[PDB]
Amino acid sequence: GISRDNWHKRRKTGGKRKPYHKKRKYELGRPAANTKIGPRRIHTVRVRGGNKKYRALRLDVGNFSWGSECCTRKTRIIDVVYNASNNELVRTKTLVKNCIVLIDSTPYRQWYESHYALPLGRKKGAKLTPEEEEILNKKRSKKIQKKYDERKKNAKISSLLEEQFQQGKLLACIASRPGQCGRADGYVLEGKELEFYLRKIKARKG
């Protein structure tokens, strides 16, 4: 059907090839997955050798990684902002590999607070009134507190990250082919990558 072959298109010299055989199967080709954002929907494609290949047609969750301290959590994709290849893949917000998405910052914040015993986001004059957040931020023995005061030293977050946390949504880049593995796994944008992409989103936006 959808042919994936070299013999259908002109030689290096601009001379036409006359096809010496009809379409073979291994010269295969199938329609594009076109993965949207919605409730989990995955169809299975049986491929050469009797192996499987999962078509994610809708996805909500995704395994994203805060790379600077090896904090990976399953979060909830909310929307797409910028795609490098094509900008109709933004309009009809398709999930493809290496597209910029926004994710829920809540599992990263929860880990950050429970690891450093310091607040992240939570704007000045934050009423922490359930006060089991204050349990996670206070009430230790002696030597355990020494370990936690030792560690809070190197919890200096990049201001670019700290804004996104306080807004409540982080930028991430999809590192897995979602149309072939049925997964929207990626990494949270940081440093020079983040400054590059934040310029690109603002510039395009206007």
Binding site: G67, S68, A84, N98, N154, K156, E190, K192, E193
Partner: protein, 143 residues
């Protein structure tokens, strides 16, 4: 200077967001006694298809032509000359076969007429299957 294309250009193996308080570079000697040249280690360019600072393995043939054209993007046309031997008349005939070959921005200045050594790699584009590995400046070319 770099990162002209819409997607962020990085050597995808090296991680550049290690918390602290220069950028590192990934490269390799590509075997067969080829000196991984100085620009590979001390450049700040990005290339998928550089045999030194990229993901291509050199294996199979090692051929050599003369640089003919340098008018396409990170690619050049070399011209390979040989004598085909007709059998009936106990004489030769001068033939040629010019191939599109991938030139890394590693080799900073090559001039049309320079001698190139090329190593076979996987198919890089429609017609490109070879990589420039060392350049030998044409007869003299000092001034």
């Amino acid at each position: 200077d770099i990162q002209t294309e819409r997607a962020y250009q990085k050597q995808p193996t090296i991680f550049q967001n290690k918390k602290r308080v220069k950028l590192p570079r990934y490269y390799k000697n590509i075997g067969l006694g080829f000196k991984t040249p100085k620009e590979a280690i001390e450049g700040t360019y990005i290339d998928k298809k550089c045999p030194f600072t990229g993901n291509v393995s050199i294996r199979g043939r090692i051929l050599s032509g003369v640089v003919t054209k340098m008018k396409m993007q990170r690619t050049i046309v070399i011209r390979r000359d040989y004598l085909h031997y007709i059998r009936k008349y106990n004489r030769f005939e001068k033939r040629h076969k010019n191939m599109s070959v991938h030139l890394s921005p590693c080799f900073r200045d090559v001039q049309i007429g320079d001698i190139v050594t090329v190593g076979e790699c996987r198919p890089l584009s429609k017609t490109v299957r070879f990589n420039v590995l060392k350049v030998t400046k044409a007869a003299g070319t000092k001034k």
